[PDB]
Amino acid sequence: IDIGRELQVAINTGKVIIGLRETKKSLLTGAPKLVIIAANAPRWAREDIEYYAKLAGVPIFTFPGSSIELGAAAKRPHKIMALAVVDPGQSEILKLVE
Amino acid sequence: PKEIFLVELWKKYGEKAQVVRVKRYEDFVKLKARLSGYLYTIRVPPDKAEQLISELKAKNVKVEEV
Amino acid sequence: PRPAYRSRSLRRVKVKTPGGRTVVHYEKRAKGVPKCAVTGQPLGGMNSKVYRFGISTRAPSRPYGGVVSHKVLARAIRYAVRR
Amino acid sequence: GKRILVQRRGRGGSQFRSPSWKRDGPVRYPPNISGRGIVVEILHEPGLNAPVAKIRMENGVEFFNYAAEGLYVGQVIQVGPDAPPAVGNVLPLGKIPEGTMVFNVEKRFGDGGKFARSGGTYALVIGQRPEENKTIVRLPSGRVIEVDARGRATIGIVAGGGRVEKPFVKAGKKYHRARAKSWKYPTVRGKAMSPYAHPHGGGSHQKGGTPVPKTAPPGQKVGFIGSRCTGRGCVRARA
Amino acid sequence: PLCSKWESLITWAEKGGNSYKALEFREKLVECIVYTATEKVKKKKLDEAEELLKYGKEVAKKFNIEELNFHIALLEKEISKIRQRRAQAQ
Amino acid sequence: PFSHTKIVGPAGRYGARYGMGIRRKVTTIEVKQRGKHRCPSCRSLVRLERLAFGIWHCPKCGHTFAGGAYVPQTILGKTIAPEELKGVEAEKAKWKEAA
Amino acid sequence: KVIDVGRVVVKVLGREAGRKAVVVDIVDENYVVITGPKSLSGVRRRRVNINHIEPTDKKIEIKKGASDEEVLKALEAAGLVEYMKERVKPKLFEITPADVK
RNA sequence: CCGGUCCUAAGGCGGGGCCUAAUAGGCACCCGCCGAAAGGGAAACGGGUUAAUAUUCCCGUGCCGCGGGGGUAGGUUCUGC
RNA sequence: CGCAGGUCGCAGUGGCAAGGGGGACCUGACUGUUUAACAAAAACAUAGGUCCCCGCGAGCCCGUAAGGGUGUGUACGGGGGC
Numbered sequence: 001i002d003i004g005r006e007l008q009v010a011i012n013t014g015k016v017i018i019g020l021r022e023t024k025k026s027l028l029t030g031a032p033k034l035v036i037i038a039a040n041a042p043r044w045a046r047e048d049i050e051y052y053a054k055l056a057g058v059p060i061f062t063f064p065g066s067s068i069e070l071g072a073a074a075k076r077p078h079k080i081m082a083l084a085v086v087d088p089g090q091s092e093i094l095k096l097v098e
Numbered sequence: 099p100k101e102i103f104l105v106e107l108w109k110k111y112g113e114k115a116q117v118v119r120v121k122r123y124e125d126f127v128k129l130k131a132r133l134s135g136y137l138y139t140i141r142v143p144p145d146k147a148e149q150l151i152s153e154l155k156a157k158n159v160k161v162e163e164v
Numbered sequence: 165p166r167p168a169y170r171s172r173s174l175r176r177v178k179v180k181t182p183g184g185r186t187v188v189h190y191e192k193r194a195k196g197v198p199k200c201a202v203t204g205q206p207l208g209g210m211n212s213k214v215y216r217f218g219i220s221t222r223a224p225s226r227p228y229g230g231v232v233s234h235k236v237l238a239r240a241i242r243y244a245v246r247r
Numbered sequence: 248g249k250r251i252l253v254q255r256r257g258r259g260g261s262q263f264r265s266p267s268w269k270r271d272g273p274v275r276y277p278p279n280i281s282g283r284g285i286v287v288e289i290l291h292e293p294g295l296n297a298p299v300a301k302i303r304m305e306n307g308v309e310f311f312n313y314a315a316e317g318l319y320v321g322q323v324i325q326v327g328p329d330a331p332p333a334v335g336n337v338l339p340l341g342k343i344p345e346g347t348m349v350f351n352v353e354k355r356f357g358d359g360g361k362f363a364r365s366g367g368t369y370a371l372v373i374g375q376r377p378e379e380n381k382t383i384v385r386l387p388s389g390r391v392i393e394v395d396a397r398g399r400a401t402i403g404i405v406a407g408g409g410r411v412e413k414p415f416v417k418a419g420k421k422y423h424r425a426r427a428k429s430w431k432y433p434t435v436r437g438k439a440m441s442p443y444a445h446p447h448g449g450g451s452h453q454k455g456g457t458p459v460p461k462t463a464p465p466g467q468k469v470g471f472i473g474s475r476c477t478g479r480g481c482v483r484a485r486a
Numbered sequence: 487p488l489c490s491k492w493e494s495l496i497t498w499a500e501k502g503g504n505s506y507k508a509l510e511f512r513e514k515l516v517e518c519i520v521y522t523a524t525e526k527v528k529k530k531k532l533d534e535a536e537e538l539l540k541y542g543k544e545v546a547k548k549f550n551i552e553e554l555n556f557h558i559a560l561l562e563k564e565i566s567k568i569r570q571r572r573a574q575a576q
Numbered sequence: 577p578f579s580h581t582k583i584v585g586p587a588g589r590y591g592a593r594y595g596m597g598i599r600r601k602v603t604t605i606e607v608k609q610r611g612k613h614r615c616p617s618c619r620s621l622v623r624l625e626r627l628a629f630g631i632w633h634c635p636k637c638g639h640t641f642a643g644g645a646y647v648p649q650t651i652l653g654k655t656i657a658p659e660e661l662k663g664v665e666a667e668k669a670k671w672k673e674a675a
Numbered sequence: 676k677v678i679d680v681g682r683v684v685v686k687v688l689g690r691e692a693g694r695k696a697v698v699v700d701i702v703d704e705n706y707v708v709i710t711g712p713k714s715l716s717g718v719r720r721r722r723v724n725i726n727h728i729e730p731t732d733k734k735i736e737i738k739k740g741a742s743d744e745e746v747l748k749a750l751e752a753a754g755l756v757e758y759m760k761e762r763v764k765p766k767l768f769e770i771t772p773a774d775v776k
Numbered sequence: 777c778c779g780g781u782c783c784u785a786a787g788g789c790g791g792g793g794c795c796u797a798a799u800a801g802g803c804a805c806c807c808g809c810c811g812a813a814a815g816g817g818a819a820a821c822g823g824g825u826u827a828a829u830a831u832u833c834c835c836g837u838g839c840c841g842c843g844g845g846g847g848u849a850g851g852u853u854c855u856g857c
Numbered sequence: 858c859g860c861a862g863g864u865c866g867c868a869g870u871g872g873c874a875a876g877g878g879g880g881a882c883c884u885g886a887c888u889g890u891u892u893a894a895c896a897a898a899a900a901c902a903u904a905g906g907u908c909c910c911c912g913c914g915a916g917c918c919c920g921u922a923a924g925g926g927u928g929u930g931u932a933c934g935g936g937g938g939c
């Protein structure tokens with residue numbers, strides 16, 4: 001499975017939300033499908049994501065790289081602490097939950 | 099010394115004044131209430147000034163021209 | 165008196181008096197503002213310049229007041245909610 | 248007069264003493280710490296050989312410890328027998344797995360830690376003798392010693408290594424480091440002295456001294472003091 | 487505006503029935519306008535000052551303050567003489 | 577190689593004093609000390625601030641940590657790092673082993 | 676969605692920080708209307724930014740635009756009227772500057 | 777309302793204790809205190825006056841600490857907006 | 858800050874203020890310290906090198922003793938030589 005390539009497909013086809021603050025808003029107020037958090041996320045940012053995700057009943061996948069490599073896997077030129085996949089437009093990114 | 103801009107607020111201080119001093123200019127008059135703690139000063143129009151001196155004299159407050 | 169003015173503990177201020185002279189006044193420097201107990205940064209609403217001790221400084225209307233900033237307080241409350 | 252400098256040092260004059268008021272306190276284990284604590288500060292201490300960490304224990308006791316390499320502000324450390332052997336944790340020597348790297352080892356329990364306290368130094372837990380309650384560890388000098396298994400040591404190596412690798416390029420640089428330490432700076436050679444002042448002082452071509460026995464009295468006990476050997480041959484004989 | 491903090495305090499004070507504090511806040515609002523405007527004219531920053539004076543005219547209408555109108559008239563007169571002397575020399 | 581010099585770059589403040597060998601050692605250590613390092617937490621390529629010897633601070637994520645005297649991580653210290661900061665590598669194994 | 680009508684929330688900022696309240700309305704994504712009754716917990720009925728509240732795991736059943744008395748019967752039905760009376764106590768000693776950077 | 781006076785620094789002294797043939801000799805320990813007219817640190821400025829004092833006297837206008845009275849906001853099971 | 862033109866003296870940084878320069882040998886690397894009152898040096902120190910005593914109840918030193926310094930330290934360290 002190519003996490004990045006599917007994320008690029010879901011980036012361009014469906015709806016993916018970039019940034020920790022948008023993700024907390026999309027977890028708290030929206031209904032996302034998959035949350036991806038970088039492995040090297042800080043303690044406050046990690047535990048905020050799991051608690052809102054545990055309340056929201058949304059799964060979390062821990063990306064096997066850092067925030068920088070997560071951003072490169074999504075083709076962005078910056079870092080990405082956490083993202084929400086609201087719509088997998090053509091990708092199989094929802095396979096990561098299992 | 100303190101400066102006050104509303105005559106309603108200054109009347110509360112000036113009525114208790116031991117002495118009210120008056121300094122006259124063309125466009126305004128300086129009214130200075132000398133209390134035990136502070137000296138309260140207001141700048142009023144000349145027409146307002148002779149009015150304020152009038153009741154303060156009726157309140158028995160000393161009015162002294164400087 | 166005099167060697168207490170040759171040290172830089174006070175501020176040398178020059179002022180022209182109504183009598184036409186120029187004199188040097190020696191005034192105190194301000195005391196440091198309250199800081200947060202976590203980051204050490206100055207606290208909003210309590211950081212105005214104060215030059216003598218014994219002056220009351222009204223803290224912001226929040227729990228814990230002028231002890232921690234709003235960032236430390238809100239985050240700590242989040243931990244207590246989950247804990 | 249005639250007393251030499253090493254005899255004058257023992258009087259405790261101000262130029263031979265440690266300015267320990269420049270530090271916040273001893274870096275020692277409090278005798279009664281256990282549970283979880285937080286690394287609240289990491290500080291430079293004048294005259295010391297490593298960065299120092301301040302630990303805010305869960306119950307509220309705060310103590311000073313030498314910071315292991317990699318320790319960071321806001322980290323959670325474990326102290327006690329039930330702690331895991333992770334870096335920065337304070338554990339008894341009995342519960343340390345063999346081959347682990349430790350520092351600030353306590354020879355006996357409660358003294359606060361004696362060995363492996365300089366920057367970049369560590370002690371290796373070599374073996375265990377639980378019957379006599381001793382732990383065999385190799386000190387930074389290479390000496391293998393037994394310590395109390397109930398005693399406490401920290402996991403990891405002391406931060407600040409490589410400090411002595413950089414030269415003290417100017418005499419002024421070593422001057423400023425001496426003022427936070429106890430050393431008298433600078434030092435006059437013995438043979439640059441007169442015979443009243445040093446055993447080596449004197450003659451028209453001044454010379455050093457041959458070694459003195461171990462039984463030599465103070466004032467005569469300078470130079471080589473009962474040395475096993477000297478020079479490169481002594482280094483070879485050691486190996 | 488510059489003295490908007492005093493406007494909100496007056497309505498908050500009057501809403502809670504604090505006639506005394508509303509008067510004190512009314513005095514502070516007039517002080518904020520006249521003092522800041524009077525400093526600008528002394529530095530002769532008439533563009534900054536006139537923006538404050540125009541705001542003061544609205545506030546006196548919005549709050550029924552004659553003393554703002556009296557003091558604003560004094561400041562506008564000073565602005566006229568400053569601008570008049572500038573035109574003469576220039 | 578350096579901004580205005582050829583070989584004595586950081587140690588050019590010493591001029592022609594102290595000897596070529598002494599100044600050469602200074603250039604070797606100081607180039608790593610004043611270079612770019614990866615913060616052990618956020619992994620950014622940033623010039624870390626050395627508060628004192630053995631104390632390093634990341635200006636991006638604010639990570640303050642103990643390291644080497646002149647370099648943020650010694651060679652031995654890079655192996656005995658805390659495993660809380662070894663989470664990226666831990667999950668990297670669990671992605672490979674599980675797939 | 677977690678921040679939904681009938682959810683007990685702890686306000687984290689402002690004068691009413693640490694107090695408990697219940698969401699009764701939703702203004703938009705950025706705002707909701709909270710009211711833990713001012714007699715009960717100390718929170719007046721007003722809009723709050725969703726970033727200034729912390730949701731709890733406890734939720735109740737009330738319709739949108741629920742009145743303040745409706746929330747009181749709901750919380751006493753859940754037996755949470757005492758839970759709405761407590762205030763959250765932070766532990767500032769556990770916080771480090773890394774948490775708020 | 778200018779300084780000392782207060783605080784502690786590097787240090788020091790005294791009592792107890794231990795040491796000492798002994799003390800007017802030593803001090804690691806306990807207790808108290810001293811230790812800065814350049815460090816920390818409450819609060820006054822302008823004018824006038826004398827042969828000689830002048831932030832000290834006199835005029836005017838204030839500030840600090842301590843205490844009291846009145847009014848006010850507030851409180852009076854409970855919470856300020 | 859620049860350009861063009863004119864012009865006076867023996868002399869225009871006109872007074873004041875204000876480096877003579879170069880080659881070579883010995884010597885101490887350098888900055889620094891020194892015989893207050895006949896010696897400022899090539900002497901001392903120095904960074905660097907190396908050797909020795911030492912795992913701390915150590916090693917070395919002070920005190921009649923009580924005890925103390927190194928030591929609020931721990932071999933990337935303390936002390937002692939060259």
Ligand SMILES: [Mg+2]
Pocket residue numbers: 168
């Ligand atoms: Mg002083």
Ligand SMILES: [Mg+2]
Pocket residue numbers: 173
């Ligand atoms: Mg000061």
Ligand SMILES: [Mg+2]
Pocket residue numbers: 261262263264425426428429430
């Ligand atoms: Mg010294």
Ligand SMILES: [Mg+2]
Pocket residue numbers: 439440441
């Ligand atoms: Mg000689």
Ligand SMILES: [Mg+2]
Pocket residue numbers: 446467
């Ligand atoms: Mg001999």
Ligand SMILES: [Mg+2]
Pocket residue numbers: 442443445446
């Ligand atoms: Mg001799």
Ligand SMILES: [Mg+2]
Pocket residue numbers: 446447448449450453454
């Ligand atoms: Mg000889």
Ligand SMILES: [Mg+2]
Pocket residue numbers: 811
């Ligand atoms: Mg004293």
Ligand SMILES: [Mg+2]
Pocket residue numbers: none
């Ligand atoms: Mg005189």
Ligand SMILES: [Mg+2]
Pocket residue numbers: none
């Ligand atoms: Mg000359």
Ligand SMILES: [Mg+2]
Pocket residue numbers: 885
């Ligand atoms: Mg020389």
Ligand SMILES: [Mg+2]
Pocket residue numbers: none
């Ligand atoms: Mg010289």
Ligand SMILES: [Mg+2]
Pocket residue numbers: 892
């Ligand atoms: Mg001489």
Ligand SMILES: [Mg+2]
Pocket residue numbers: none
């Ligand atoms: Mg001479």
Ligand SMILES: [Mg+2]
Pocket residue numbers: none
């Ligand atoms: Mg020499």
Ligand SMILES: [Mg+2]
Pocket residue numbers: none
């Ligand atoms: Mg050499």
